[PDB]
Amino acid sequence: AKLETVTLGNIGKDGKQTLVLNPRGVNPTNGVASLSQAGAVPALEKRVTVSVSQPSRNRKNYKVQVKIQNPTACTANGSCDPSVTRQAYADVTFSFTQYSTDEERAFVRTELAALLASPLLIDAIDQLNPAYAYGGAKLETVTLGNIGKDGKQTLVLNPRGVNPTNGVASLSQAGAVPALEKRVTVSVSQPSRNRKNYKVQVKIQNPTACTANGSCDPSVTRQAYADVTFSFTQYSTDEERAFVRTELAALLASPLLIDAIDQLNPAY
């Protein structure tokens, strides 16, 4: 509910870098909290924005929006002062209903945090090897330990094939009815021609079943939709990319996003 200074450790490939995000206050025009570093020039600032949207007459859902930027400073050979040659965005969005409790919300946040540490994405984010690749990705049953509210749940996502039409992968639960699978899709498809950038997309589809006396057959409710999208350009090194992925994992364990996700409190 109240902003503080957020400190994230073991960031990067080596897990030795550390980031301190000083809060820069809550913009009340669009209700977006903002956190940045201290670098005394606004261009060279790693910015993190968190916003929580109430359900409206149009939206009719809860929606949490997390964006993060990471500019890169060059020498600027002719000039004296350094400029921003490129920046690496990353955007996370969540979707929930009012009937969705916190434990489903806390499940998604912890599953997403453990998913970024998984060997599938660190091949997909750093090396840019898509899941849709005989020799690019392992494409094996990913086990996600210690997720949940108390961190005592474990998830195994079985690879239910790769769709070549959209290029996306699919990592589903090992359940029976196809409407009840907790299917996670990773799309590392990289259109470098029209977008001139690299897009990585993950959807933690996390459906929920609660039905009785409906002819003794369960029905999907809410579905706990979640989405993550990365944006990198050419010439961006993988350590710049691995810096983004690792600090995204650190924010999902951060107390500023615990109450923002679980209790849905906008941290003013």
| Residue 137, in any domain of the structure | yes
Establish if 268 belongs to a structural domain: no
Confirm whether 132 is domain-assigned. yes
CB atoms within 10 A of CB 218: 14
Domain assignment present for residue 111? The answer is yes
Tell me whether residue 267 is in a domain.
Answer: no
User: Which tokens belong to 200?
Assistant: 């990585």
Angle, CA 158 vertex, CA 154 and CA 160 arms, to 5°: 150
When divided into structural domains, the chain yields a total of 1
> Distance (Å, rounded) from C-alpha 125 to C-alpha 132?
14
Q: Is 28 inside any structural domain?
A: yes
Question: b or e along 83-100 (b: 16 or more beta carbons within 10 Å of the residue's beta carbon)?
Answer: eeeebbbbbbebbbbeeb
Query: Which two tokens mark 54?
Result: 């109430």
Look at residue 1 and tell me if it is in a domain: no
Q: Specify the residue for token string 């969005």.
A: 93
How far is 189 from 231, CA to CA, in rounded Å? 11
Order of strands, sheet of 32-36, starting from the edge strand that comes earlier in the sequence: 6-11, 17-27, 32-36, 48-53, 62-68, 89-96, 226-232, 198-204, 184-187, 171-172, 153-159, 142-147
Return d(Cα 185, Cα 203) in angstroms, integer: 5
CATH label of the domain that carries residue 236: 3.30.380.10
Nearest-angstrom CA–CA distance, 215 and 203: 31
Place of tokens 């020498």: 75
In a domain? residue 204: yes
**Token match 């997403």: residue?**
112
- As given in the structure block, the two tokens for residue 138 are 């392992």
Q: How many CA atoms lie within 13 A of 266 on its CB side?
A: 20
- Backbone φ and ψ of 263, nearest 5°: -90, -5
Asked if 151 contacts 110 with a C-beta cutoff of 8 angstroms, the reply is yes
**If DSSP states are collapsed to H, E and C, what string results for the chain?**
CCCCCEEEEEECCCCCEEEEEEEEEEECCCCEEEEECCCCCCCCCCCEEEEEECCCCCCCCEEEEEEECCEEECCCCCCCCCCEEEECEEEEEEEECCCCCHHHHHHHHHHHHHHHCCHHHHHHHCCCCCCCCCCCCCCCCEEEEEECCCCCEEEEEEECCCCCCCCCCCEECCCCCHHHCCCEEEECCCCCCCCCCEEEEEEECCCEECCCCCCCCCCEECCCCEEEEEEECCCCCHHHHHHHHHHHHHHCCCHHHHHHHCCCCCCC
Q: What is the residue range of 238's domain? A: 6-261
Burial of residue 31 (CB within 10 Å: 0-12, 13-18, 19+) is middle
